Design a binder for this molecule. Structure first.
Ligand SMILES: [Cu+2]
Ligand SMILES: [Cu+2]
Ligand SMILES: [Cu+2]
Length: 439
Protein backbone atom coordinates (compact mmCIF):
# COMPACT_ATOMS: atom_id res chain seq x y z
CA UNK A 1 0.00 0.00 0.00
CA UNK A 2 0.96 3.67 0.21
CA UNK A 3 4.01 4.47 2.31
CA UNK A 4 1.84 6.66 4.54
CA UNK A 5 -1.09 4.83 6.16
CA UNK A 6 -4.32 6.78 6.63
CA UNK A 7 -7.82 5.55 7.48
CA UNK A 8 -10.05 4.57 4.59
CA UNK A 9 -12.39 7.39 3.54
CA UNK A 10 -16.17 7.11 3.13
CA UNK A 11 -17.60 10.06 1.19
CA UNK A 12 -21.15 11.32 0.97
CA UNK A 13 -22.82 10.47 -2.35
CA UNK A 14 -25.33 12.83 -3.90
CA UNK A 15 -25.67 14.76 -0.64
CA UNK A 16 -26.12 11.68 1.56
CA UNK A 17 -23.68 9.70 3.70
CA UNK A 18 -25.62 6.57 4.68
CA UNK A 19 -23.47 4.06 6.51
CA UNK A 20 -23.81 1.15 8.92
CA UNK A 21 -20.95 0.81 11.40
CA UNK A 22 -20.47 -1.87 14.03
CA UNK A 23 -18.54 -1.36 17.26
CA UNK A 24 -16.91 -4.79 17.59
CA UNK A 25 -13.87 -6.54 19.10
CA UNK A 26 -11.63 -6.94 16.07
CA UNK A 27 -8.48 -9.03 15.51
CA UNK A 28 -5.94 -7.11 13.67
CA UNK A 29 -2.26 -6.40 13.10
CA UNK A 30 -0.99 -3.19 14.67
CA UNK A 31 2.56 -1.88 15.13
CA UNK A 32 3.87 -5.25 13.98
CA UNK A 33 1.92 -7.38 16.49
CA UNK A 34 -1.48 -9.06 16.54
CA UNK A 35 -4.03 -7.65 18.95
CA UNK A 36 -7.78 -7.52 19.48
CA UNK A 37 -9.04 -3.94 19.68
CA UNK A 38 -12.51 -2.41 19.86
CA UNK A 39 -13.12 -0.79 16.47
CA UNK A 40 -15.67 0.93 14.30
CA UNK A 41 -15.81 -0.46 10.79
CA UNK A 42 -13.24 -3.15 11.54
CA UNK A 43 -10.28 -0.74 11.54
CA UNK A 44 -8.12 1.31 13.90
CA UNK A 45 -8.74 4.20 13.61
CA UNK A 46 -12.26 3.88 12.30
CA UNK A 47 -13.07 5.14 8.80
CA UNK A 48 -12.79 8.84 8.01
CA UNK A 49 -16.19 10.23 7.04
CA UNK A 50 -15.84 13.04 4.48
CA UNK A 51 -18.87 15.30 3.97
CA UNK A 52 -19.77 18.82 2.86
CA UNK A 53 -22.14 21.42 4.32
CA UNK A 54 -25.85 20.60 3.88
CA UNK A 55 -25.16 16.86 3.41
CA UNK A 56 -27.40 14.46 5.29
CA UNK A 57 -25.54 12.00 7.53
CA UNK A 58 -27.38 8.76 8.34
CA UNK A 59 -25.12 6.60 10.52
CA UNK A 60 -26.51 3.41 12.05
CA UNK A 61 -24.28 2.26 14.92
CA UNK A 62 -24.65 -1.43 15.79
CA UNK A 63 -23.30 -2.23 19.26
CA UNK A 64 -21.46 -5.56 19.18
CA UNK A 65 -19.60 -4.82 22.46
CA UNK A 66 -20.38 -6.60 25.75
CA UNK A 67 -21.24 -3.23 27.32
CA UNK A 68 -23.50 -0.32 26.32
CA UNK A 69 -22.09 2.48 24.19
CA UNK A 70 -23.07 5.59 22.22
CA UNK A 71 -21.52 8.22 19.94
CA UNK A 72 -20.44 11.79 20.50
CA UNK A 73 -20.09 13.79 17.27
CA UNK A 74 -17.23 15.78 18.72
CA UNK A 75 -17.19 19.40 17.56
CA UNK A 76 -20.30 19.32 15.38
CA UNK A 77 -22.74 22.14 16.16
CA UNK A 78 -25.80 19.91 15.83
CA UNK A 79 -28.78 19.26 18.09
CA UNK A 80 -28.10 17.48 21.40
CA UNK A 81 -31.21 15.45 20.56
CA UNK A 82 -28.94 13.82 17.94
CA UNK A 83 -25.53 14.25 19.61
CA UNK A 84 -27.17 12.86 22.76
CA UNK A 85 -24.68 12.42 25.64
CA UNK A 86 -27.26 10.51 27.74
CA UNK A 87 -28.32 7.88 25.19
CA UNK A 88 -27.38 4.24 25.80
CA UNK A 89 -27.23 1.61 23.06
CA UNK A 90 -27.39 -1.78 24.84
CA UNK A 91 -25.23 -4.68 23.62
CA UNK A 92 -26.66 -6.17 20.44
CA UNK A 93 -28.84 -3.12 19.71
CA UNK A 94 -28.54 -0.42 17.05
CA UNK A 95 -29.33 3.29 16.82
CA UNK A 96 -29.45 5.58 13.78
CA UNK A 97 -27.96 9.07 14.07
CA UNK A 98 -29.38 11.39 11.41
CA UNK A 99 -28.42 15.03 11.05
CA UNK A 100 -27.73 17.69 8.45
CA UNK A 101 -24.25 19.18 8.26
CA UNK A 102 -24.52 22.91 9.09
CA UNK A 103 -24.02 25.33 6.22
CA UNK A 104 -21.30 27.49 7.84
CA UNK A 105 -18.86 24.75 8.84
CA UNK A 106 -15.45 23.42 7.84
CA UNK A 107 -12.69 21.45 9.47
CA UNK A 108 -11.66 18.20 11.12
CA UNK A 109 -14.05 16.66 13.67
CA UNK A 110 -14.26 13.18 15.16
CA UNK A 111 -16.55 10.55 16.66
CA UNK A 112 -16.04 8.40 19.78
CA UNK A 113 -18.01 6.94 22.74
CA UNK A 114 -19.64 9.13 25.39
CA UNK A 115 -21.30 6.71 27.82
CA UNK A 116 -20.53 8.15 31.25
CA UNK A 117 -18.22 5.95 33.31
CA UNK A 118 -17.18 3.85 30.29
CA UNK A 119 -15.54 6.43 28.02
CA UNK A 120 -11.90 5.92 29.03
CA UNK A 121 -11.73 2.12 28.48
CA UNK A 122 -13.75 2.25 25.24
CA UNK A 123 -11.76 5.11 23.71
CA UNK A 124 -8.46 3.59 24.86
CA UNK A 125 -9.37 0.27 23.24
CA UNK A 126 -9.68 1.82 19.77
CA UNK A 127 -13.18 3.26 19.30
CA UNK A 128 -12.70 6.50 17.34
CA UNK A 129 -12.60 7.95 13.83
CA UNK A 130 -12.40 11.29 12.06
CA UNK A 131 -15.03 13.33 10.25
CA UNK A 132 -13.91 15.94 7.70
CA UNK A 133 -16.21 18.75 6.53
CA UNK A 134 -14.81 19.88 3.18
CA UNK A 135 -15.29 23.51 2.17
CA UNK A 136 -15.29 25.72 -0.90
CA UNK A 137 -12.11 27.20 0.59
CA UNK A 138 -10.40 23.91 -0.30
CA UNK A 139 -10.59 25.06 -3.94
CA UNK A 140 -8.32 28.10 -3.55
CA UNK A 141 -5.06 27.25 -5.35
CA UNK A 142 -2.82 27.52 -2.30
CA UNK A 143 -4.77 24.71 -0.62
CA UNK A 144 -5.97 22.69 -3.63
CA UNK A 145 -2.42 22.16 -4.88
CA UNK A 146 -1.07 21.11 -1.48
CA UNK A 147 -0.69 17.43 -0.61
CA UNK A 148 -3.28 16.66 2.05
CA UNK A 149 -3.08 14.05 4.82
CA UNK A 150 -4.91 13.26 8.05
CA UNK A 151 -2.77 12.45 11.11
CA UNK A 152 -4.70 10.72 13.91
CA UNK A 153 -2.44 11.00 16.97
CA UNK A 154 -3.36 8.23 19.41
CA UNK A 155 -1.26 6.11 21.74
CA UNK A 156 -1.88 2.59 22.98
CA UNK A 157 -0.60 -0.02 25.41
CA UNK A 158 -1.13 -3.75 24.91
CA UNK A 159 -1.17 -6.56 27.47
CA UNK A 160 -1.82 -10.14 26.45
CA UNK A 161 -2.87 -9.09 22.96
CA UNK A 162 -5.55 -6.67 24.22
CA UNK A 163 -5.59 -3.03 25.34
CA UNK A 164 -3.98 -2.76 28.75
CA UNK A 165 -6.44 -2.42 31.66
CA UNK A 166 -6.82 0.82 33.60
CA UNK A 167 -5.07 0.95 36.98
CA UNK A 168 -6.07 3.31 39.80
CA UNK A 169 -3.22 5.62 38.82
CA UNK A 170 -4.58 5.61 35.25
CA UNK A 171 -7.98 6.84 36.50
CA UNK A 172 -6.22 9.65 38.40
CA UNK A 173 -3.88 10.79 35.61
CA UNK A 174 -5.57 9.65 32.44
CA UNK A 175 -4.00 6.64 30.72
CA UNK A 176 -1.05 7.00 28.33
CA UNK A 177 0.46 4.15 26.34
CA UNK A 178 3.97 3.29 25.21
CA UNK A 179 2.96 2.79 21.55
CA UNK A 180 2.78 6.37 20.25
CA UNK A 181 1.10 5.91 16.89
CA UNK A 182 -0.02 7.93 13.88
CA UNK A 183 -3.08 6.52 12.09
CA UNK A 184 -2.54 3.30 14.04
CA UNK A 185 0.99 2.92 12.65
CA UNK A 186 4.32 3.05 14.50
CA UNK A 187 6.53 5.89 13.18
CA UNK A 188 5.39 5.77 9.53
CA UNK A 189 7.29 7.43 6.72
CA UNK A 190 5.60 10.17 4.72
CA UNK A 191 7.37 10.51 1.36
CA UNK A 192 6.05 13.87 0.20
CA UNK A 193 5.40 14.30 -3.50
CA UNK A 194 4.68 18.03 -3.26
CA UNK A 195 6.55 20.78 -1.46
CA UNK A 196 3.49 22.05 0.44
CA UNK A 197 1.66 19.67 2.77
CA UNK A 198 -1.76 20.32 4.31
CA UNK A 199 -1.94 18.23 7.48
CA UNK A 200 -5.17 17.70 9.41
CA UNK A 201 -4.23 16.84 13.00
CA UNK A 202 -6.41 15.06 15.57
CA UNK A 203 -5.48 14.24 19.16
CA UNK A 204 -7.67 11.19 19.77
CA UNK A 205 -5.70 10.03 22.83
CA UNK A 206 -7.28 9.57 26.25
CA UNK A 207 -4.74 11.81 27.98
CA UNK A 208 -1.46 12.12 26.07
CA UNK A 209 -0.42 15.59 24.85
CA UNK A 210 1.48 16.24 21.60
CA UNK A 211 3.87 19.21 21.70
CA UNK A 212 4.34 19.11 17.94
CA UNK A 213 7.48 20.31 16.17
CA UNK A 214 8.85 19.47 12.74
CA UNK A 215 12.64 19.47 12.54
CA UNK A 216 14.04 22.57 10.81
CA UNK A 217 10.57 23.93 9.92
CA UNK A 218 7.84 26.17 11.28
CA UNK A 219 4.19 25.19 10.96
CA UNK A 220 1.52 27.47 9.48
CA UNK A 221 -1.69 27.06 11.46
CA UNK A 222 -4.75 27.42 9.20
CA UNK A 223 -7.57 25.87 11.26
CA UNK A 224 -8.35 25.19 14.91
CA UNK A 225 -10.76 22.57 16.32
CA UNK A 226 -13.87 23.73 14.54
CA UNK A 227 -13.00 26.04 11.66
CA UNK A 228 -10.42 28.02 9.75
CA UNK A 229 -8.42 30.92 11.14
CA UNK A 230 -8.78 34.28 9.40
CA UNK A 231 -5.26 34.02 7.98
CA UNK A 232 -2.34 31.60 8.40
CA UNK A 233 -0.39 31.92 11.66
CA UNK A 234 3.27 30.91 11.82
CA UNK A 235 4.22 28.86 14.90
CA UNK A 236 7.43 27.13 15.90
CA UNK A 237 5.52 24.39 17.73
CA UNK A 238 1.90 23.44 18.33
CA UNK A 239 0.48 21.78 21.45
CA UNK A 240 -2.51 19.50 20.84
CA UNK A 241 -4.33 18.48 24.01
CA UNK A 242 -6.74 15.51 24.08
CA UNK A 243 -9.75 16.18 21.86
CA UNK A 244 -8.19 19.12 19.99
CA UNK A 245 -7.71 19.37 16.24
CA UNK A 246 -5.65 21.66 14.04
CA UNK A 247 -4.77 22.04 10.38
CA UNK A 248 -1.31 23.20 9.35
CA UNK A 249 0.53 23.93 6.15
CA UNK A 250 4.11 22.67 5.93
CA UNK A 251 6.41 24.33 3.38
CA UNK A 252 9.26 21.91 2.80
CA UNK A 253 12.43 23.97 2.57
CA UNK A 254 15.07 21.56 1.21
CA UNK A 255 15.59 17.92 0.36
CA UNK A 256 16.04 15.54 3.26
CA UNK A 257 14.49 13.61 6.14
CA UNK A 258 12.75 15.61 8.87
CA UNK A 259 11.34 14.22 12.12
CA UNK A 260 7.89 15.23 13.28
CA UNK A 261 8.24 14.95 17.06
CA UNK A 262 6.12 15.17 20.20
CA UNK A 263 8.55 17.20 22.31
CA UNK A 264 8.78 16.86 26.11
CA UNK A 265 5.73 18.28 27.86
CA UNK A 266 4.74 18.16 31.54
CA UNK A 267 0.94 18.02 31.90
CA UNK A 268 1.12 17.41 35.65
CA UNK A 269 0.71 13.63 35.80
CA UNK A 270 1.55 12.29 39.26
CA UNK A 271 3.40 9.26 40.58
CA UNK A 272 4.08 7.94 44.07
CA UNK A 273 7.33 7.64 46.00
CA UNK A 274 8.45 6.11 49.31
CA UNK A 275 11.76 7.52 50.60
CA UNK A 276 11.37 6.36 54.22
CA UNK A 277 8.61 8.73 55.37
CA UNK A 278 5.31 7.29 54.10
CA UNK A 279 4.28 7.19 50.45
CA UNK A 280 3.82 10.63 48.90
CA UNK A 281 2.70 11.93 45.54
CA UNK A 282 5.51 13.09 43.25
CA UNK A 283 5.30 14.64 39.77
CA UNK A 284 6.02 12.37 36.82
CA UNK A 285 7.53 15.40 35.06
CA UNK A 286 7.75 15.91 31.30
CA UNK A 287 6.98 13.16 28.82
CA UNK A 288 9.89 11.56 27.02
CA UNK A 289 10.36 12.89 23.47
CA UNK A 290 8.70 10.78 20.79
CA UNK A 291 9.15 10.61 17.05
CA UNK A 292 5.74 10.58 15.39
CA UNK A 293 6.73 10.14 11.73
CA UNK A 294 9.59 10.56 9.27
CA UNK A 295 8.90 13.22 6.62
CA UNK A 296 10.92 12.87 3.39
CA UNK A 297 10.94 16.01 1.24
CA UNK A 298 10.76 15.81 -2.57
CA UNK A 299 13.59 16.83 -4.85
CA UNK A 300 14.14 20.58 -5.24
CA UNK A 301 11.09 21.60 -3.18
CA UNK A 302 9.44 24.88 -4.21
CA UNK A 303 6.45 25.35 -1.87
CA UNK A 304 3.36 27.25 -2.93
CA UNK A 305 2.80 30.76 -1.57
CA UNK A 306 0.72 30.77 1.58
CA UNK A 307 -2.89 31.92 1.18
CA UNK A 308 -3.22 35.56 2.17
CA UNK A 309 -6.62 34.99 3.78
CA UNK A 310 -8.74 32.07 4.92
CA UNK A 311 -12.23 32.70 6.38
CA UNK A 312 -13.42 35.88 8.14
CA UNK A 313 -14.45 35.12 11.67
CA UNK A 314 -18.01 36.17 12.57
CA UNK A 315 -18.51 39.33 14.61
CA UNK A 316 -20.45 38.06 17.54
CA UNK A 317 -23.26 39.90 19.36
CA UNK A 318 -22.50 41.41 22.74
CA UNK A 319 -22.74 38.79 25.52
CA UNK A 320 -25.61 38.66 28.00
CA UNK A 321 -23.99 36.79 30.91
CA UNK A 322 -20.64 35.78 32.41
CA UNK A 323 -20.19 32.33 33.96
CA UNK A 324 -17.34 31.27 36.27
CA UNK A 325 -16.51 27.36 36.23
CA UNK A 326 -13.73 26.38 38.62
CA UNK A 327 -11.94 23.05 38.15
CA UNK A 328 -10.50 21.24 41.19
CA UNK A 329 -8.95 17.84 41.96
CA UNK A 330 -8.86 15.20 44.67
CA UNK A 331 -5.96 13.29 43.13
CA UNK A 332 -5.64 10.51 45.72
CA UNK A 333 -9.38 9.81 45.42
CA UNK A 334 -9.26 10.17 41.60
CA UNK A 335 -12.18 12.58 41.89
CA UNK A 336 -12.55 15.75 39.84
CA UNK A 337 -15.00 18.61 40.25
CA UNK A 338 -16.55 21.64 38.57
CA UNK A 339 -17.58 24.34 41.05
CA UNK A 340 -17.18 21.78 43.82
CA UNK A 341 -19.52 19.14 42.35
CA UNK A 342 -19.26 15.90 40.38
CA UNK A 343 -21.49 15.11 37.41
CA UNK A 344 -25.11 14.17 38.05
CA UNK A 345 -27.09 13.48 34.87
CA UNK A 346 -30.31 14.56 36.62
CA UNK A 347 -28.92 17.97 37.68
CA UNK A 348 -28.87 21.00 35.38
CA UNK A 349 -25.90 23.20 36.27
CA UNK A 350 -26.27 26.06 33.77
CA UNK A 351 -29.37 27.43 32.03
CA UNK A 352 -28.88 29.68 29.01
CA UNK A 353 -30.85 31.19 26.15
CA UNK A 354 -30.39 30.04 22.55
CA UNK A 355 -29.04 32.70 20.16
CA UNK A 356 -27.43 34.72 22.96
CA UNK A 357 -23.70 34.92 23.61
CA UNK A 358 -22.17 34.11 26.98
CA UNK A 359 -18.71 34.72 28.42
CA UNK A 360 -17.37 31.64 30.18
CA UNK A 361 -14.41 32.07 32.53
CA UNK A 362 -13.03 28.57 33.16
CA UNK A 363 -10.42 28.46 35.94
CA UNK A 364 -8.07 25.55 36.62
CA UNK A 365 -7.38 25.52 40.36
CA UNK A 366 -5.78 22.07 40.09
CA UNK A 367 -2.19 21.13 39.39
CA UNK A 368 -2.75 19.05 36.22
CA UNK A 369 -3.52 20.46 32.81
CA UNK A 370 -7.25 20.05 32.06
CA UNK A 371 -8.57 20.32 28.47
CA UNK A 372 -12.08 21.70 28.87
CA UNK A 373 -14.64 20.60 26.23
CA UNK A 374 -18.16 21.92 25.56
CA UNK A 375 -20.56 19.95 23.39
CA UNK A 376 -22.87 21.47 20.76
CA UNK A 377 -21.76 25.14 21.07
CA UNK A 378 -18.34 26.00 19.57
CA UNK A 379 -16.58 28.92 21.22
CA UNK A 380 -14.04 31.67 20.53
CA UNK A 381 -11.09 31.62 22.94
CA UNK A 382 -10.40 35.23 23.94
CA UNK A 383 -7.48 34.67 26.33
CA UNK A 384 -5.85 31.95 28.45
CA UNK A 385 -3.59 32.53 31.44
CA UNK A 386 -3.88 36.30 31.03
CA UNK A 387 -2.55 36.26 27.45
CA UNK A 388 -4.81 37.20 24.50
CA UNK A 389 -5.31 34.44 21.98
CA UNK A 390 -3.37 35.27 18.79
CA UNK A 391 -6.13 34.28 16.34
CA UNK A 392 -9.89 34.06 15.92
CA UNK A 393 -11.32 30.62 15.09
CA UNK A 394 -13.94 28.21 16.39
CA UNK A 395 -12.73 25.87 19.11
CA UNK A 396 -14.47 23.30 21.27
CA UNK A 397 -11.63 22.20 23.60
CA UNK A 398 -9.41 24.65 25.50
CA UNK A 399 -6.37 23.51 27.46
CA UNK A 400 -5.78 25.05 30.89
CA UNK A 401 -2.46 24.70 32.64
CA UNK A 402 -2.43 24.77 36.44
CA UNK A 403 -3.76 28.07 37.75
CA UNK A 404 -4.85 29.41 34.37
CA UNK A 405 -8.15 31.10 33.52
CA UNK A 406 -9.55 30.88 30.00
CA UNK A 407 -12.10 33.45 28.86
CA UNK A 408 -14.41 32.07 26.16
CA UNK A 409 -17.08 33.71 24.01
CA UNK A 410 -19.84 31.09 23.75
CA UNK A 411 -22.73 31.64 21.33
CA UNK A 412 -25.54 29.28 22.30
CA UNK A 413 -26.90 27.49 19.21
CA UNK A 414 -29.16 24.42 19.40
CA UNK A 415 -31.72 24.13 22.19
CA UNK A 416 -31.64 21.17 24.55
CA UNK A 417 -29.65 19.52 27.31
CA UNK A 418 -25.92 18.97 26.71
CA UNK A 419 -22.69 18.63 28.71
CA UNK A 420 -19.27 20.16 29.27
CA UNK A 421 -16.38 18.15 30.66
CA UNK A 422 -12.67 17.58 30.88
CA UNK A 423 -11.39 15.74 27.81
CA UNK A 424 -8.94 13.72 29.80
CA UNK A 425 -11.72 11.19 29.54
CA UNK A 426 -10.80 9.40 32.78
CA UNK A 427 -11.55 12.67 34.60
CA UNK A 428 -14.93 12.90 32.87
CA UNK A 429 -15.72 9.32 33.89
CA UNK A 430 -14.66 10.20 37.45
CA UNK A 431 -16.93 13.22 37.71
CA UNK A 432 -15.49 16.30 35.96
CA UNK A 433 -18.61 17.01 33.88
CA UNK A 434 -21.67 19.26 34.15
CA UNK A 435 -25.00 19.87 32.42
CA UNK A 436 -25.96 22.89 30.32
CA UNK A 437 -29.58 23.40 29.31
CA UNK A 438 -30.27 25.81 26.43
CA UNK A 439 -33.82 27.09 25.94
CU1 LIG B 1 -14.54 14.22 22.21
CU1 LIG C 1 -9.05 16.77 33.64
CU1 LIG D 1 -18.17 15.04 25.55
Amino acid sequence: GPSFPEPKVVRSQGGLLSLKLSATPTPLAIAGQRATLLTYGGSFPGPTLRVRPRDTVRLTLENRLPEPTNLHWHGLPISPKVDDPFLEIPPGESWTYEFTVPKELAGTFWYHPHLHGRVAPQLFAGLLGALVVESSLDAIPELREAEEHLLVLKDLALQGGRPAPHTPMDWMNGKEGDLVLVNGALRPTLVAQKATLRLRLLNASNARYYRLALQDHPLYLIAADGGFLEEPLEVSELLLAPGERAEVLVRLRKEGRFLLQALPYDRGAMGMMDMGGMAHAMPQGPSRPETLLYLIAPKNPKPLPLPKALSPFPTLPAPVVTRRLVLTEDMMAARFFINGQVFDHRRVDLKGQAQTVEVWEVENQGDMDHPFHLHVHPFQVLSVGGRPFPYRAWKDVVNLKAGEVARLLVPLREKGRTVFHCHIVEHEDRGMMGVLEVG
